[PDB]
Design a binder for this molecule. Structure first.
Ligand code: ZCQ
Ligand code: ZN
Lengths: 21, 28
């Protein structure tokens, strides 16, 4: 989940892009 | 709970900027 991987650990801009459409 | 909600607000804004026109999906 988005929360599981970015609210516990920091996320790069590339990691967040995986959640784009 | 509260900690998770505050992070979600920023995550949701960040996704908005990265994805741009493609859009995104948020499910907690
Ligand atoms: O902690 N993160 O993974 C995070 C939260 C909000 C925005 C962002 O770019 C990264
Ligand atoms: Zn805040």
């Amino acid at each position: 989940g988005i929360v599981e991987q970015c609210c516990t650990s920091i996320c790069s801009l590339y990691q967040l892009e995986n959640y784009c459409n | 709970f509260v900690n998770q909600h505050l992070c979600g607000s920023h995550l949701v804004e960040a996704l908005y900027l990265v994805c741009g026109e493609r859009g995104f999906f948020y499910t907690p």
